[PDB]
Amino acid sequence: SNTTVEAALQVAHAISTHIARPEIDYFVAADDVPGEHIGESMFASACFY
Amino acid sequence: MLIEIHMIQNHSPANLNRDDLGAPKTCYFGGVLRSRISSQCIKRSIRTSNDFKALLGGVRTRRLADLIQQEAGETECWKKAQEILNKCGFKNKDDNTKMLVFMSKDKIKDLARIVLDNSLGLTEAAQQVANVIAQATLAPDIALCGRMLEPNDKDKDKKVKWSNTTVEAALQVAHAISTHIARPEIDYFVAADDVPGHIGESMFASACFYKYFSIDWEQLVKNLKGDTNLAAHTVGAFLLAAAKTNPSGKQNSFAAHNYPDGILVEFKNSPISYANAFVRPVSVVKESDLVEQSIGQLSNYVNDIRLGYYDEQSPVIGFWFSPNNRYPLGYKHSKLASRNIGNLNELVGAVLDYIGGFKWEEVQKSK
Amino acid sequence: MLIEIHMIQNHSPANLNRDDLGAPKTCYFGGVLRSRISSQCIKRSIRTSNDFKALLGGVRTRRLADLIQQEAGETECWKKAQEILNKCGFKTKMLVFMSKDKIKDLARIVLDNSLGLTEAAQQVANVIAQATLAPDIALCGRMLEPNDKDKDKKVKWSNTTVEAALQVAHAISTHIARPEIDYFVAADDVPGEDAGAGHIGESMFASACFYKYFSIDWEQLVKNLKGDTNLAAHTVGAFLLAAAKTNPSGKQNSFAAHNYPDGILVEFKNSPISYANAFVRPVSVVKESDLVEQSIGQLSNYVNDIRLGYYDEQSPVIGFWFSPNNRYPLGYKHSKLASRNIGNLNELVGAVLDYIGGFKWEEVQKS
Amino acid sequence: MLIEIHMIQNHSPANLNRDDLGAPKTCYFGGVLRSRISSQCIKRSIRTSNDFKALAPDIALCGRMTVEAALQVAHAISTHIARPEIDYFVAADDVHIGESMFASACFYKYFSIDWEQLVKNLKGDTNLAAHTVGAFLLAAAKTNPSGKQNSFAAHNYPDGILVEFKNSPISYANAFVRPVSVVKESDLVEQSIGQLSNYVNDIRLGVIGFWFSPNNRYPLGYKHSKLASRNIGNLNELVGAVLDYIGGFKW
Amino acid sequence: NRGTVDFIASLENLKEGDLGILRKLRGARLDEKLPGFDLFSALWWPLRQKNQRAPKREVAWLIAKLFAEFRFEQREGATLPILMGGICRKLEPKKELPRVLARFDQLASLDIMQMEEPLSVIMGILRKHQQVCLDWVGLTDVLSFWEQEPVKREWSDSFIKAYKI
Amino acid sequence: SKIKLMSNDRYTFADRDWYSPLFSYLHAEGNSRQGKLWLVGFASDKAKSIDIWDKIIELEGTDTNDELLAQLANRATALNAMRKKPLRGDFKKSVGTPQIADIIPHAENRIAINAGKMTENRGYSWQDADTEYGELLTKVAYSLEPAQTVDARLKRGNFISRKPWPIIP
């Protein structure tokens, strides 16, 4: 039979009010045993509508 | 008399029109890629709009039998109606019922009455149905878009003659194109599962579009059997719908409900398109924005065209509309538009007064 | 003398001329693929335009019997018309091109007379042969060939050849061709089980910048229209205006490509020269400039090379360059190739008429 | 002596010569099919023309009925592969699909004139022969066959002419055994002229000549080579130089 | 050819941040954004110094952007006209095959500055069918000399040979 | 003889028509006999002369096949049918691929060398003579489809496989 329900809610993608500034964080995991690998992550901050 | 509407509208990230692969439609203009919206989508959005609810009456479908049966209510009548329609000439090649029929919605009762006649046989009923269909062209949507219908000569009964089923269109719509270089983008999505117990891809884009509509007053009046009030109401409702309606595709995910930032309405005897204002793509600078630069280039091209070609013994009259005079026209001219209007309602009133003199309420009371 | 017209025109995405398969026409130039608009399409579009209706005094049709019948209130003159035309030699029916008033009046008076069939056919043939007084006939020529296999042996034909006074070349793109395909799906108004995956259609469209070439011989145009001279000037002016502001009516209800030319060059020579070789190397778009500017620059370079090449002091040539409001100059850096750069179309028409003779456009608009 | 003229000319899409079936004339060369313009079309195109109408001349150059004409015209050949095309047309009624053939190609043309025969046919006159040579050069430079010109206004002008005074007759068709393939950094006419240049760069290594291009648009030799004795940017100056070399006559 | 192998090797040595920087520069030119210009210069200029037959700037920029977006694994003998052409044997001949074939064939009427989006859709079609390997060096070599007829002829012939199997 | 100077709707100029007076001769008068057959043909039309040609065929006299000889005696129709096929589509009053008529005479001249073996079907056959058109059709296909795409290559492959078909009546 019919298995379709029309959506009653409309949402839009949250976009910024300014120019985005992506940033890179460099991380190095440590070791708890002495003895005888630079990492790269991304983050940003913004204002959303 | 030709009424021409030029619109500039900026949209949020969305997918209003997509191809068979799911990507936004694109075109090549001036040697560069632009985003595109098909004219059929705009026409369908305007036709199936709240502002066009009153001026409807045309139906385009492959399922005339269902409507004919629903009109009566308890007669069965499905098989007999289907046989009559097959005898009429609606091609059934490849076992697919097709050849979409477009006609007025008030003539379905006549078809149901004619089909339910026991005195007549089948060929006479088919001829009567064809005659009824060929003379149902009295709706504003049909008068605007037009209609073509060519039944095939292979499955129809040989004793069936068709009259003229063609009505010339009174509306011309061009494909929407972007004023800059298109930048399609990919979105990566995942469908999660609630019970604890891969990656997809979609396409979207954002662009600023230039839209062009043209309406012939004489042809629209002629199609509606000389009803001038109905034509004025149709023009007003079309302006309202084109201003305040957007295509409905992927809107539940992208709520792109933006309104035009500039509308120019002109009256002239010949059609002129201002698309050549954007052969050079718009490049954004740090001291301005996209809409202002697009409007500036449009104003420059309009001034050049007005001072180059349109200057004849016949004058040209146009009005310019921006919301609360937010975006003025060319700063170096300040005289291209004979009137600057800050509201849509007074713009519609001005057009209706210019056509032949019409009040909004009086033409609203025509349907 | 010879009047030479060169145009550069950029069009929006559309399909103006299409082949049997429903695709835009193409050709090979310089070893690469270019878009093409046929010459007969342009001639037909100019002939049936609003700026030429004052000189449209010829009809090309095979249904002459209907036209002869329409020149009668109640008299039955259809079967006899077909019989007379069959004895003439028009036995598929042959297309006949000639003036309207002559065929109407003379065919009505001769056909309705009580005379022999052979004599009536001979008089009809003579009237058809001698009816070569119309600007369109003079511009496009005529070639009538009666069928000697199934014509009455008693009748004899006279000269029916009119040498043309206009030469039109196929429009070719200044760059490489980029054909595009748009996919459409037709919707149904009434909900239901619907079809399967859907019938996806295909529509082919393209956008290109075309170079157009026209050549008019004034002496042959005068000779075709007999010793009359003002009519020739009116025809030249109307042809220039129509070619400036008319486009073919292809898929214009969905592709409103009503763009206007950006550059026109009118030269007065004694021998024909074509500037097509300016675009043997295709135009490539860079981050600076646009397509039209590069095309006009290449055209100016080729014109300068030709002028500084084949040059005779005993027959110098002059011309006028027209751009809307002087927005696209020819000699961008230093060269003054043109003599009387004009920024208005009507001023250009007036200058052309003045050079042809002591002609004012107002005075010649009476023949 | 013998005067040999080589011309390179590009034509817009047209049909200047067709056969009984309506298709453009063709030939076979270099293992491929090439477009062809008949010799008896270029002749009777240069002849019987209004421009050329400038001891009866026009018979010494081209004889009629033992006149022993002094002009030799070869068959025009293409420098690339033939690309015939079909146009589909219909006729309206304002009250059946047909097909036509057309093509576009770049042609190499060869003409030869025998000076001694021209002088003997004119009964010793030498200024009239020089005037006839100049008139023929001007007419051949500015004339095209009158084919389907009303539908294909192909009135292009030659992009390169070479005049030579060799001891024996020889044509440079062997410079076009390999069909020209268009590259992005060049065009068809430039590549054809370069191929011609790399056929007189040889031969001499393993006579004099005058080269003419409109305003020096296309120079012979893609270097600072002296393969051409003189490079001239005007047609009248080329005629004057040839007139001077013929023995010092003034145009 | 040496010069392209080392370029692809250097591209394969990049990390997530540089890949994202190149990803955000898709559809853009080399000059407008400075970080992308600096990264491309650092990756490319020594190769142009050492080797004269190195790929041109435009082709290298296009290949870098495509690799940043798609990140295929380099493997010799896995060129585009083979994978596309082996894929085309599983579609419906009447409808889907012409639609894919037109998109594959449109590449012959575009220059190197307009070959981003069609290649993007082709590589998306590849990714939709679980493809993990591609020959980047061969693609760069073909794109370098795209204005030569024998190159296109070999491209189409390879496509047909892969398809007819 | 049925030779003409032009190619009309019902004729295609190829070469001397040496295959016409073969079914009649080898079945009514002359029959099979080892020797050299001399053929003299003189085309005419009312009071106008067109052309005369002659030929010599080496015959061994090894039986005859009625169907194959009848097919050989009717080959101008097959060549005309091959020529009249358009490049694409079906149009009324269409001349059809004029480039094929430019290459037909050379193939006919090449085929005519083995006339004696083709007449008696010793080692030469219709399919054997069909091979001579392959190289010429391949050369023509490049001119007809000058594109570097897959569709052009497929169209060339389809075009290469054209050959005349024997029609007995």
Write the DSSP string, C165-200: -EEEPPEEESS----EEE------SS-SS--SS---
Helix, strand, or coil here: D203?
A: coil
Tell the residue number behind the tokens 């006209």, with chain if given. Answer: E81
Phi, psi of D215 (to 5 degrees): 55, 35
C-alpha to C-alpha distances, C323 to C68, C169, C338, C345, D76, nearest whole angstrom: 47, 22, 12, 9, 40
The alpha carbon of residue D87 is apart from the nearest alpha carbon of chain C, in Å, by 8
Phi, psi of D86 (to 5 degrees): -115, 130
CA F93-F94-F95 angle, 5° bins: 120
B324 torsion bin: left (phi>0), alpha (psi -120 to 50), beta (else) = left
Task: Look up residue B150 and give its two tokens.
Answer: 């060519």
Write the DSSP string, D96-137: --EEEEEB--EEEEEEEEEHHHHHHHTTT-SHHHHHHHHHHH
Strands C166-168 and C161-162: unpaired
The alpha carbon of residue E140 is apart from the nearest alpha carbon of chain B, in Å, by 23
**Residues pairing with B5 in the sheet:** B213, B265
Q: What is the 3-state secondary structure (H, E, C) of F73-137?
A: HCCHHHHHHHHHCCCCCCCCCCCCCHHHHHHHHHHHHHHHHHHHHHHHCCCCCHHHHHHHHHHHH
- Interface present between F and D (3 or more CB pairs within 8 Å): yes
Residue B124 · residue B117 · CB < 8 Å? no
Resolution in Å equals 2.5
| Torsional sign, CA B288, B291, B295, B297 | positive
* Chain F CB within 8 Å of residue E157 CB: yes
* Chain B CB within 8 Å of residue A10 CB: yes
By C-alpha distance, the chain E residue nearest B22 is: E121
Of C207, C324, C346, Cβ closest to residue B304: C324
Any chains having at least 3 CB pairs less than 8 A from chain B are: A, C, E
Closest CA to E163 of E101, E116, E112, E110: E101
The alpha carbon of residue C59 is apart from the nearest alpha carbon of chain D, in Å, by 8
Q: Which amino acid is at F136?
A: L
Task: Look up residue B132 and give its two tokens.
Answer: 């009824």
Chain B interface mutation, best of A6, A9, A11, A13, highest count of B Cβ atoms under 10 Å: A13
d(CA C296, CA C172): 15
C-alpha to C-alpha distances, C135 to C55, C142, C239, nearest whole angstrom: 6, 12, 10
CA atoms within 13 A on the CB side of B148: 4
* E111·C33 Cβ contact <8 A: no
* Chain B CB within 8 Å of residue A14 CB: no
Which of chain D's residues have a Cβ under 8 Å away from the Cβ of E114?
none
Closest CA to D69 of D122, D146, D25: D122
* E108·F149 Cβ contact <8 A: yes
Give the distance, in angstroms, between the CA of residue D138 and the centroid of all CA atoms in the same chain: 12
Helix, strand, coil % over all residues of chain A, rounded to 5: 0, 15, 85
d(CA B164, CA C313): 64
Task: Look up residue F111 and give its two tokens.
Answer: 């085929």
Other C-beta atoms within 10 Å of C279: how many? 23
Of F6, F94, F143, Cβ closest to residue D99: F94
Any chains having at least 3 CB pairs less than 8 A from chain E are: A, B, C, D, F
* Chain F CB within 8 Å of residue E44 CB: no
* E109·C284 Cβ contact <8 A: no
DSSP D18: B
Closest CA to B205 of B4, B69, B16: B16
Which of chain D's residues have a Cβ under 8 Å away from the Cβ of E148?
181, 183
**Residue ranges in chain C assigned as alpha helix (H):** 39-47, 64-70, 79-88, 100-111, 117-130, 135-140, 218-224, 230-244, 291-307, 345-356, 361-364
After which residue numbers is chain C interrupted with C–N beyond 2.5 angstroms?
A: 91
d(CA D124, CA D118): 9
By C-alpha distance, the chain E residue nearest C201 is: E95
Of B20, B21, B184, Cβ closest to residue E117: B184
The alpha carbon of residue E164 is apart from the nearest alpha carbon of chain B, in Å, by 25
**Residues pairing with F37 in the sheet:** F57
| Torsional sign, CA E137, E139, E145, E150 | positive
User: How many Cβ pairs closer than 8 A exist between chain C and E?
Assistant: 11
End-to-end CA distance of chain A: 40
* C254·B169 Cβ contact <8 A: no
Of E104, E149, E156, Cβ closest to residue F153: E156
Other C-beta atoms within 10 Å of B123: how many? 14
Of D32, D97, D99, Cβ closest to residue F142: D32
Closest CA to F40 of F56, F59, F28: F56
Tell the residue number behind the tokens 């983050």, with chain if given. Answer: A43
- Interface present between F and E (3 or more CB pairs within 8 Å): yes
The alpha carbon of residue E27 is apart from the nearest alpha carbon of chain B, in Å, by 6
Which of chain E's residues have a Cβ under 8 Å away from the Cβ of D181?
148-149
Q: Which amino acid is at B112?
A: A
Of E101, E104, E156, Cβ closest to residue F148: E156
